[PDB]
Amino acid sequence: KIRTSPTFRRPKTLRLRRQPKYPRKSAPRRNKLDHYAIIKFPLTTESAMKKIEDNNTLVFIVDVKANKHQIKQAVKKLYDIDVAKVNTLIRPDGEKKAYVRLAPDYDALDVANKIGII
Amino acid sequence: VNPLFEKRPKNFGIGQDIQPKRDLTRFVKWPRYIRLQRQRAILYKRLKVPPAINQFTQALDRQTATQLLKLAHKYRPETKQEKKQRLLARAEKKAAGKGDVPTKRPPVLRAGVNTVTTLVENKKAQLVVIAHDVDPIELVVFLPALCRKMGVPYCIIKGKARLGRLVHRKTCTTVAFTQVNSEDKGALAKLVEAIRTNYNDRYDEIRRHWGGNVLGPKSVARIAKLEKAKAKELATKLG
Amino acid sequence: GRGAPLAKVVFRDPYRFKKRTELFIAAEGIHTGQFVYCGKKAQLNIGNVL
RNA sequence: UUGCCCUCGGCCGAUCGAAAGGGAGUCGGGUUCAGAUCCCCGAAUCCGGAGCGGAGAUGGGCGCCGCGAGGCGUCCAGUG
RNA sequence: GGAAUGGGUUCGCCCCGAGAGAGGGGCCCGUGCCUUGGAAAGCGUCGCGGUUCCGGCGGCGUCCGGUGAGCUCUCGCUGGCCCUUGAAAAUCCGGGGGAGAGGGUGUAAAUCUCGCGCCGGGCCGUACCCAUAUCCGCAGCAGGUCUCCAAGGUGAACAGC
RNA sequence: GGCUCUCGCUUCUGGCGCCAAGCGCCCGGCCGCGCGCCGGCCGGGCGCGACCCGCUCCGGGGACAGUGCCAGGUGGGGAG
Ligand SMILES: [K+]
Ligand SMILES: [K+]
Ligand SMILES: [Mg+2]
Ligand SMILES: [Mg+2]
Ligand SMILES: [Mg+2]
Ligand SMILES: [Mg+2]
Ligand SMILES: [Mg+2]
Ligand SMILES: [Mg+2]
Ligand SMILES: [Mg+2]
Ligand SMILES: [Mg+2]
Ligand SMILES: [Mg+2]
Ligand SMILES: [Mg+2]
Ligand SMILES: [Mg+2]
Ligand SMILES: [Mg+2]
Ligand SMILES: [Mg+2]
Ligand SMILES: [Mg+2]
């Protein structure tokens, strides 16, 4: 019953966690940004061609919401390939362009043929 | 005994070893609400409390109040669940024979200042018990005087919460006895005689008994030290 | 902005194991490493507080 | 890991405020029509998280066996 | 170790029985040089090919010295000036202390700021002009608009030529 | 011991100082124990240490200051 401090501090009180009687939302929101929304369409420009032929990297236009982890995960099991690196930029028209460099064993030219880029 | 053990006393002098963890309860910076209720208790002692409010400081002593509650326990108001039992039982049992048996409603305590005030005015209250800690005190500050005027004995008791427990509520400003059973008539009479001498018969001096007007311990101590100095002077004059 | 020097004076804290640094107006003559004493029972010396 | 309790905790003041202040750690060569310490090649590094070594640490005492070396028992050490 | 017969020393100072000089050593920086990187690459030059829009393939070379009140940057040392004394915080580290923790002689234990290995680093900006034509001034306006780099000659000199 | 006043432990030194020693109480567990006294070991809490009581944290003001509302003066500071 001894107070060894000249200061009175608010006692620590129990704080219960929420146990709602009803969820405020009936159902979880559907993930709008899925693998198909992440990848919009591959870029098929001369510069993108050089990237496919030389750097073994594919060029995609992707959702601006998506990040490198999502882009890598989307490309990985959309086209059933492995991805080594993802470099993203936002082009002046507001789109996000992703340079997706595949693993060395995968061939970008082969994958471009299956996609339909060339 | 191990020779390695030795005393290591600490010198708690000024400039010496760090002071111990002493009890600082006296010097704690309490919250505003704790300071407010404490300073209010002091203002009641410091200020001149008029006799109408001050008379509630005179409460029944411990053994009388315990005796009073012992009798009042026998006349506690029925709980709503207890009343429901009484009813179903009365309705079903009286259905078998003759339903029309009003008989007599047994005696019971009457609670609430409004119920008691009317009972006193009609002289139907044999004994009125008022809590001493009613706030606002206006609710009962007239009640001791009113009981005196109608000649009904009244006693002030410690704790509105104590009265509230009789009537199964949190608090109760006052309770009143109107009727008691045959065996409790003697027990009630002894209490009424003791209470009447304490409160009703003494009400002339209660009306003028001002309270408070007591200075705090430090100021009174300075006053006593000055009085000792004045006494030293009186002793020198005698010499 | 002040024409008078200030003295950083370090005292032990009475109630906690901790050093307390105090900024004093420097009385002329005090020097670094000098002990200064503050209290009712301190001695009448330059820099002491009484 | 979880809830409780004890112990200790001044957060002596939320928060915002610098693309010139403070602030870990990337450089060389090559490549485009236009990019680059950002791409490619090569060589590093910082920060964050959870295997193999190495260190800690293998010292001394006394008896016994053994040509000896070495081993055995047993006690005492060991945060370089 | 012990200095006056004072000595050491700078452009200037300044330093010394509170330890000069002299001898031996310790620490910090290390942007320089050599090495791993590394010559394989770059560059110069002379050739030979081709898929003639190849990071093409070869040969040889990429050397040896000097100088400085030079200039710029950088790092130190040492002063002067002030009634002017020239941020804070994030963040990181060392020490004092010693509550603890660790195993009983081992296939040791807690433990480890040593070496190596494994995994990861999300988001936004990044083009170009930056000005006698991409900015403001109604304009490709003699105005205005914050910086870094800075060769040879003459000469005191980012003067002028 | 009676009555009063004062005092409570720190002043050669540019060191250190917290997270209780010690005494006392009680509760235990474990292992022996010779069936009997209990002991050893391993601990846990507590009081003293650090006195008791008390109604404002301490100190300085103080029914003044101040504030609220009137009243008179001053008021090119400002307005017309
Ligand atoms: K900044
Ligand atoms: K005026
Ligand atoms: Mg980017
Ligand atoms: Mg901020
Ligand atoms: Mg900056
Ligand atoms: Mg460019
Ligand atoms: Mg070569
Ligand atoms: Mg220089
Ligand atoms: Mg240590
Ligand atoms: Mg650029
Ligand atoms: Mg112009
Ligand atoms: Mg101009
Ligand atoms: Mg305009
Ligand atoms: Mg020049
Ligand atoms: Mg010139
Ligand atoms: Mg005017």
CB A48 within 8 A of CB A97: no
> Residue A89: beta bridge partners?
A97
CB B163 within 8 A of CB B172: yes
In the chain, the amino acid numbered A57 is T
Q: What spatial distance separates the first Cα and last Cα of chain A, rounded to whole Å? A: 83
Choose among B87, B128, B88, B123: nearest CA to B111.
B128
DSSP C43: -
Cα A5 from chain centre: 53
Count of Cβ atoms closer than 10 Å to residue B86 Cβ: 11
CA distance A98 to A42: 9
| Structure tokens that stand for A7 in this block | 């200061």
**Alpha helix positions (H), B132-214:** 138-141, 143-149, 160-166, 184-195, 203-206
H-run or E-run covering A83: strand A83-90
Mention every residue, 6+ apart, whose C-beta is less than 8 A from residue A105.
Answer: A82
Closest nucleotide to the alpha carbon of B30, via C1': F57
At residue B84, the 3 state secondary structure works out as helix
Strand E contact at CB of residue A44, distance < 7 A: no
| CB pair distance less than 8 Å for B22 and A8 | no
Distance from CA(C34) to C1'(E15), angstroms, rounded = 28
In the chain, the amino acid numbered B165 is R
CB B142 within 8 A of CB B207: no
Distance from CA(B9) to C1'(F59), angstroms, rounded = 34
State yes or no: cis peptide before B136, omega within 30 of 0.
yes
In the chain, the amino acid numbered C28 is E
Experimental method reported for this structure: cryo-EM
Mention every residue, 6+ apart, whose C-beta is less than 8 A from residue B27.
Answer: A6
CA distance B58 to B53: 10
CA distance B105 to B83: 12
CA distance A30 to A3: 56
Beta-carbon-side half-sphere exposure of residue B33 (alpha carbons within 13 Å): 2
| Interface residues 24-63 of B with strand F (CB < 7 Å) | 26-27, 29-30, 35, 38-39, 42, 45-46
For chain B, give the number of residues: 239
CB B208 within 8 A of CB B201: no
Long-range contacts of A110-114, Cβ-Cβ distance < 8 Å, separation of 24 or more: A111/A58, A111/A79, A111/A81, A112/A42, A112/A52, A112/A58, A114/A79
CB A63 within 8 A of CB A31: no
Strand E contact at CB of residue A84, distance < 7 A: no
Mention every residue, 6+ apart, whose C-beta is less than 8 A from residue B42.
Answer: B216
Angle (CA) A13-A17-A20 rounded to 5° is 135
- Which position has the token pair 């009244």? B154
At residue B101, the 3 state secondary structure works out as coil
CA distance B46 to B230: 26
CA A54 → CA A47, A109, B75, distances in Å? Answer: 11, 9, 102
CA B111 → CA B76, B86, B168, B199, distances in Å? Answer: 10, 21, 11, 20
Mention every residue, 6+ apart, whose C-beta is less than 8 A from residue B127.
Answer: B152, B153, B154, B155, B176, B177, B188, B191, B192, B195
Give the mutation candidate from B18, B19, B24, B32 for the A interface (greatest A CB count, under 10 A).
Answer: B24
- Which position has the token pair 């609710």? B139
**DSSP secondary structure letters along B19-75:** PP----GGG-B--HHHHHHHHHHHHHHHSEE-HHHHGGG----HHHHHHHHHHHGGG
| Structure tokens that stand for B105 in this block | 């409603």
At residue B132, the 3 state secondary structure works out as coil
Strand F contact at CB of residue B22, distance < 7 A: yes
Cα C28 from chain centre: 13
Closest nucleotide to the alpha carbon of A69, via C1': E122
CA distance B162 to B143: 19
The dihedrals phi and psi of B63, each to the nearest 5 degrees, come to: -75, -35
At residue B131, the 3 state secondary structure works out as strand
Choose among B96, B88, B150: nearest CA to B118.
B150
Choose among B235, B122, B108, B103: nearest CA to B175.
B108
Strand E contact at CB of residue A68, distance < 7 A: yes
Choose among B192, B162, B190: nearest CA to B177.
B192
CA distance B223 to A77: 94
Choose among C35, C46, C45: nearest CA to C10.
C35
Mention every residue, 6+ apart, whose C-beta is less than 8 A from residue A35.
Answer: A73, A74, A77, A78
H-run or E-run covering B156: strand B154-157
| B66/C contact by beta carbon, under 8 A | no
CA distance B130 to B127: 10
At residue A51, the 3 state secondary structure works out as helix
Mention every residue, 6+ apart, whose C-beta is less than 8 A from residue B12.
Answer: B19, B20
In this complex, which chains have at least 3 CB pairs below 8 Å with chain A?
B
Mention every residue, 6+ apart, whose C-beta is less than 8 A from residue B20.
Answer: B10, B12
CA distance B78 to B163: 15
Ligand nearest to the CA of A91: 3
Using a 10 angstrom Cβ sphere, with 0-12 exposed, 13-18 middle and 19 or more buried, the burial of residue A58 is: buried
Closest nucleotide to the alpha carbon of C17, via C1': F18
Resolution (A): 2.6
> Residue B111: beta bridge partners?
B175
Distance from CA(A87) to C1'(E34), angstroms, rounded = 41
Strand D contact at CB of residue A85, distance < 7 A: yes
CA distance B198 to B64: 11
CA distance C11 to A7: 23
Cα B35 from chain centre: 23
**CA-CA-CA-CA torsion sign (B160, B162, B163, B166):** positive
CB B131 within 8 A of CB B176: no
**CA-CA-CA-CA torsion sign (B97, B102, B107, B109):** positive
In the chain, the amino acid numbered B118 is T
Q: Which nucleotides of F are covered by protein (CB under 7 A)?
A: 8-11, 13-14, 17-23, 49-50, 54-57
Q: B109 CA to chain A: closest CA distance, Å?
A: 41
Q: What spatial distance separates the first Cα and last Cα of chain B, rounded to whole Å? A: 65
Beta-carbon-side half-sphere exposure of residue B204 (alpha carbons within 13 Å): 2
CA distance B7 to C16: 23
d(CA B69, ligand 15 centre) in Å: 116
Mention every residue, 6+ apart, whose C-beta is less than 8 A from residue B28.
Answer: A3, A5, A6, A7, A8
CA distance A10 to A17: 20
H-run or E-run covering B130: strand B127-131
